[PDB]
């Protein structure tokens, strides 16, 4: 961590004065203090040693999640600013707009240990909430890497295998060989080649192919076809990691990092990521991605599609003038017309740009920004909303490259200021909700290794396919991983692939997919048999540790911040208040009835709303439902609700949601 020498100079005053009076440089402490006032340069010398190996704390309030502070190795630095490592910036969510921070200082050996182990930089890489890394590379380094991994077809002296008049003329025995070549004006970095490696682990397929037994890269030898970019990229990684040969997207990067963390030790990971950052900046320099207005093409045939949709809206306006449709009818019609126009325009825009446009290439790599920002840049902005929230039927028909008009700009101002107003309200409610949550669960800590219960829930686990496969559910990693089987995964009504007591991460999951099974009674906090808090066993892996958590943890608070943090990004019941009232346990506005016994429906609709009643199967009282608003809609599922539809004992009648209380009183806790 960077440090203004002037600042720390004032910081360690006690330490420095002590250590210097240890030297024969100040007779009393008072001599030391006034000398500090005098700053006799040897003061800086002993300042060096006293600064040596002493951790520190760093705070950018406001903090949401656990990484609001960490411990860094200080080191004296010129200037009067706080030099910060790049990768932590995403953790702090701290741009370089000029946000300040705070820096605290431990004193005890115990505090020093707490820092030097827990709050260390390197010890905190992954999402404590979601397991994924957070020092993963980003915008600029990611940009460089994407440039480095992309392949240029038809490039500078590519590997062009063609004998009969010359060799294949792309082969290189050594990476250094290729290095020298491309250092001469010979080779583009992204030209495809066929070199032979001896120092990097090839892919599993070819590696097993040549060997099967031991593809070990320091001394094995083997050929491959890539570009030197991918070459160097894999060169960054540890030796044991096999080859990649792909175009590194950010997602690819994250997957790699996850693999690394899940399999290797931490210190290797940190060093690896650092080298990543370094070379990434190195190549982002060379990528030459800059932005001139000439870089921003527009839809060359925009105007005609403009005219098409305009004719549409014109006919619509004429017919409104007819009175054939009322005010809001033509309003919504225009809404649809201009939305369709926007969609087609974005279509043409996306197809039109070449791929080497850095303007697009950023989002292409996925560095940042969406295609809508693109369309806003060049082409047409489209719709500006009612400051109330409705949509303005005008609408914008230009992009910034064209520049707006007075009226257009004025219109855009509405939604602009509206959003910026909402920005503070949302973050304000977030902290309130967070306080509520954590004050709720303040005292939930592991206290027992194992409750040793046998309760535990089963999981959908990548639902069966009707054509027949274990088609994977999307939402499995968030559920399955870091879980503990109480049951034992038999196979084929035979051998058990996996038993009680495992952590249930990738490989075993994959084996389970191979087995063809989609239900697993895994332990959970709901079944943690412990009285005073939780058992270690039913909690499973810690998302940040990567391993099974210790018994000194109050996971409740971690989960608390885990929930509270993303609340800022919760961009709108269908939003944050929805979430609140859910935790509020309130009866929602959209209270939809829920079944109370199976049977068909005595579906029925009175005037201006619906008037229905349950077909009991015992039977008995047809469970009647009366104030069924016509604005409400029959819950579609399996087909939408129809009369005589045989339903279940707890099926939600309408769309929306009934309270948690009644669903409790019907179908109980689980």
């Amino acid at each position: 961590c960077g440090l203004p020498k002037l600042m720390a100079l004032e910081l360690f005053k006690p330490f420095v004065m002590k250590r210097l009076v240890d030297l024969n440089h100040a007779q009393n402490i008072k001599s030391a203090k006034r000398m500090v006032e005098r700053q006799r340069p040897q003061v800086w010398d002993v300042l060096e040693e006293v600064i040596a190996e002493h951790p520190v704390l760093l705070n950018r309030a406001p903090t949401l999640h656990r990484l609001g502070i960490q411990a860094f190795e200080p080191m004296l630095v010129e200037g009067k600013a706080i030099q910060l490592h790049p990768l932590v910036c995403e953790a702090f969510n701290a741009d370089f707009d000029g946000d300040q921070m705070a820096v605290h200082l431990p004193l005890s050996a115990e505090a020093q240990a707490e820092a030097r182990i827990l709050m260390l930089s390197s010890n905190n890489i992954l999402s404590p909430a979601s397991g994924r890394p957070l020092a993963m590379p980003r915008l600029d380094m990611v940009t460089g890497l994407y440039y480095l991994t992309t392949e240029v077809p038809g490039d500078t002296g590519e590997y062009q295998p063609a004998s009969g008049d010359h060799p294949e003329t792309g082969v290189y025995s050594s990476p250094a060989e290729a290095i020298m070549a491309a250092d001469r004006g010979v080779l583009s970095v992204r030209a495809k080649i066929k070199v032979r490696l001896t120092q990097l682990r090839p892919p599993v397929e070819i590696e097993a192919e040549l060997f099967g037994h031991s593809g070990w890269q320091p001394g094995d030898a083997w050929m491959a076809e890539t570009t030197l970019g991918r070459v160097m990229f894999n060169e960054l990684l540890p030796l044991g990691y096999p080859f990649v040969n792909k175009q590194m997207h950010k997602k690819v990067q994250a997957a790699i990092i996850n693999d690394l963390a899940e399999r290797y030790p931490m210190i290797v990971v940190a060093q690896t990521v650092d080298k990543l950052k370094d070379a990434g900046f190195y190549w982002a320099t060379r990528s030459g991605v800059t932005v001139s207005m000439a870089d921003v093409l527009v839809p060359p045939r925009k105007k005609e599609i403009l005219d098409h949709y305009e004719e549409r809206a014109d006919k619509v306006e004429k017919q409104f003038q007819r009175g054939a449709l009322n005010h809001d009818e033509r309003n919504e019609a225009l809404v649809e017309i201009w939305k369709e126009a926007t969609d087609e325009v974005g279509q043409a825009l996306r197809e039109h740009y070449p791929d080497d446009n850095p303007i697009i290439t950023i989002v292409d790599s996925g560095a940042t920004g969406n295609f809508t920002q693109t369309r806003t840049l060049a082409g047409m902005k489209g719709l500006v909303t009612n400051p109330k929230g409705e949509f303005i039927p005008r609408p914008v028909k230009s992009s910034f490259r064209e520049g707006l008009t007075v009226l257009e700009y004025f219109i855009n101002t509405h939604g602009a200021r509206k959003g910026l107003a909402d920005t503070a309200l949302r973050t304000a409610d977030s902290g309130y909700l967070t306080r509520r949550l954590v004050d709720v669960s303040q005292d939930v800590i592991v206290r027992e290794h194992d409750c040793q219960t046998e309760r535990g829930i089963v999981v959908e686990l990548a639902e069966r396919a009707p054509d027949g496969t274990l088609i994977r559910d999307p939402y499995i990693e968030t559920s399955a991983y870091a879980r503990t089987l109480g049951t034992d995964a038999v196979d084929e009504a035979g051998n058990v692939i996996v038993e009680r007591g495992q952590d249930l991460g990738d490989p075993e999951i994959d084996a389970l997919l191979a087995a063809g099974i989609t239900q697993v009674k895994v332990r959970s906090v709901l079944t943690c048999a412990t009285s005073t808090g939780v058992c270690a066993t039913c909690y499973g892996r810690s998302m940040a540790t990567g391993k099974l958590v210790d018994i000194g943890e109050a996971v409740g608070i971690v989960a608390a911040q885990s929930i509270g943090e993303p609340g800022t990004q919760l961009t709108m019941t269908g939003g944050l208040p929805r979430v609140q009232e859910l935790f509020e346990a309130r009866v929602p506005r959209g209270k939809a009835p829920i079944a109370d016994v199976t049977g068909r429906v005595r579906l029925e609709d009175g005037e201006r709303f619906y008037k229905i009643t349950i077909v009991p199967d015992d039977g008995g009282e047809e469970v009647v439902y009366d104030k069924i608003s016509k604005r409400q809609r029959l819950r579609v599922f399996k087909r939408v609700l129809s009369d005589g539809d045989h339903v279940e004992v707890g099926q939600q009648l309408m769309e929306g949601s009934a309270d948690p209380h009644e669903v409790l009183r019907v179908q109980g806790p689980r």
Binding site: S163, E177, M180, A181
Partner: protein, 237 residues
């Protein structure tokens, strides 16, 4: 100019022919000023001999097939490429590699004429399937840096002789970076790290002094205008 401080050179001995170099302190910042320069130097400053274009019997235009052996043409080529072998001869030297029967051809298997001095003869190159005989001639000369496989000097010199690259740099790998040692007392002087790794031909140590001499030979040009000019002096060693 009085140097006011004297940088120093402590070579690091890494693995045998991968020795390392570091230097400091520096007038901030000479690291970028000169380390890169010296890098490109050692890349392209010292002479070296290497194959020019081999010729191989039998094969005429099919640039991919080799009877009686396992390896293809290009495998032969690349294996040839990594041959550390020297000579004192500023001319195009021809050569021979000949053998029959099954087995394998390696580095030391060659017939060395005068001047040639293989520096890794215990190095496998080629395999011999079943009774196969080879008699290949080799074209090595010496030069500097590294060359692409130059195109045919003539239109077609000979169907047999076929061009190759020439790694005339006995150096193999070079890298470095700049540092900021003693930024307050030395007021941010600088520290160079130097990673070199080269063939067993010579020591990276020796190559360093050689290239440094070459560079100072260069800059003698620069100095030889007004040697009676105020230059930033370092003082004695």
């Amino acid at each position: 100019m009085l140097i006011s401080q004297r940088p120093t050179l402590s070579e690091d001995v890494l693995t045998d022919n991968r020795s390392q170099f570091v230097i400091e302190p520096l007038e901030p910042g000479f690291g970028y000023t000169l380390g890169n320069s010296l890098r490109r130097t050692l890349l392209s400053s010292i002479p070296g001999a290497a194959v020019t274009s081999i010729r191989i019997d039998g094969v005429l235009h099919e640039f991919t097939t080799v009877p009686g052996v396992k390896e293809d043409v290009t495998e032969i080529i690349l294996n040839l490429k990594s041959l550390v072998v020297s000579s004192e001869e500023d001319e195009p030297v021809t050569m021979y590699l000949r053998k029959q029967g099954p087995g394998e051809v390696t580095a030391g298997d060659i017939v060395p004429p005068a001047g040639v001095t293989v520096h890794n003869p215990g190095m496998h190159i080629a395999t011999l399937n079943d009774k196969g005989k080879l008699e290949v001639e080799l074209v090595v000369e010496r030069g500097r840096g590294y060359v692409p496989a130059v195109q045919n000097r003539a239109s077609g010199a000979e169907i047999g002789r076929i061009p190759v690259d020439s790694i005339y740099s006995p150096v193999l790998k070079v890298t470095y970076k700049v540092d900021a040692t003693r930024v307050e007392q030395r007021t941010d002087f600088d520290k160079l790290i130097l990673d070199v790794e080269t063939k067993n031909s010579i020591s990276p140590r020796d190559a360093l002094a050689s290239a440094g001499k070459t560079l100072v030979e260069l800059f003698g040009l620069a100095r030889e205008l007004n040697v009676e000019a105020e230059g930033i002096e370092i003082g004695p060693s």
